[PDB]
Amino acid sequence: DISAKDLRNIMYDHLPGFGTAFHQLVQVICKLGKDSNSLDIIHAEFQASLAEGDSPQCALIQITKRVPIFQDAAPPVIHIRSRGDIPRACQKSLRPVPPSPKIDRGWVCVFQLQDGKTLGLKI
Ligand SMILES: O=C(C1=C(O)C(=O)N(c2ccc(Cl)c(C(=O)O)c2)[C@H]1c1cc(Br)cs1)c1ccccc1
C-alpha cells in the first residue's frame, strides 16, 4: 500500500520549483488523506487527471474538488513559530485569513504563528 510519504514523493516528482504553494497543497492532501484513509483514491484521481492531460497543479486542484473529504472543507491549521518556517516560494501566496476559507476554493491551509498571527495560503 502507498504511504503518505510515497504519495507526497510521487506528487512532488511532477511539480516544478520547490516549496511552492502546490507542494504545500500536496502536504495537506497527504495529511488529510492519511487521516481519512483516502490515500488510494487520492492517488488514483491524481494519476487519472494526469493521464487525461491535465497539468499536475490542475490535478491537485481537481483532487480538492473531487475527493469528498476536501469538499466544502475548512483549511487545516498548521502551527509554526514564524513566517520564516514557511517556504520562500510560498511567501507571496500568504494572505490575511478571510471568513470561512475553503480548501476547494484555494485556501490550502492556515498557518498559525506563535505570537498569534494567522496567514492563509492561497492558490
Ligand atoms: O506541511 C507541513 C507538514 C510537516 O512538516 C509534516 O510532517 N507534515 C505531514 C504531512 C503528512 C502527514 Cl501524513 C503528516 C503526519 O502524519 O504527521 C505530517 C506536514 C503537515 C500537513 C498538515 Br495539514 C499538518 S502538518 C509543514 C509545513 C511548513 C511548516 C510546518 C509544517
From Swiss-Prot:
Effect ascribed to mutating residue 102 to A: Complete loss of dsRNA binding activity
Single GO biological process annotation from the record: positive regulation of protein sumoylation
Q: Find the cross-link Glycyl lysine isopeptide (Lys-Gly) (interchain with G-Cter in ubiquitin).
A: 92
The listed outcome for residue 100 to D is: No effect on viral replication
Supply the alphabetized keyword list. Coiled coil, Host cytoplasm, Host-virus interaction, Inhibition of host IKBKE by virus, Inhibition of host innate immune response by virus, Inhibition of host IRF7 by virus, Inhibition of host RLR pathway by virus, Inhibition of host TBK1 by virus, Inhibition of host TLR pathway by virus, Interferon antiviral system evasion, Isopeptide bond, Phosphoprotein, RNA-binding, Suppressor of RNA silencing, Transcription, Ubl conjugation, Viral immunoevasion, Viral RNA replication, Virion
Q: Which domain of life is it from?
A: Viruses
An example Gene Ontology CC term for this record: host cell cytoplasm
Effect on the protein upon substituting residue 92 to R: Partial loss of the ability to efficiently antagonize the type I IFN response
How does it get modified post-translation? Phosphorylated by host IKBKE. Phosphorylation contributes to efficient viral replication and transcription.
**Subunit details for this protein?**
Homodimer. Homooligomer; via the coiled coil domain. Interacts with nucleoprotein NP and polymerase L; VP35 bridges L and NP and allows the formation of the polymerase complex. Also interacts with VP30; this interaction is regulated by VP30 phosphorylation. Interacts with host IKBKE and TBK1; the interactions lead to inhibition of cellular antiviral response by blocking necessary interactions of IKBKE and TBK1 with their substrate IRF3.
What does the record give as the function of this protein?
A: Plays an essential role in viral RNA synthesis and also a role in suppressing innate immune signaling. Acts as a polymerase cofactor in the RNA polymerase transcription and replication complexes. Serves as nucleoprotein/NP monomer chaperone prior to the formation of the large oligomeric RNA-bound complexes. Regulates RNA synthesis by modulating NP-RNA interactions and interacting with DYNLL1. VP35-NP interaction controls the switch between RNA-bound NP and free NP and thus the switch between genome replication and genome packaging into the nucleocapsid.
Q: What is this protein called?
A: Polymerase cofactor VP35
Q: Which gene encodes it?
A: VP35
Q: Which residues of the full protein are shown?
A: 218 to 340 of 340
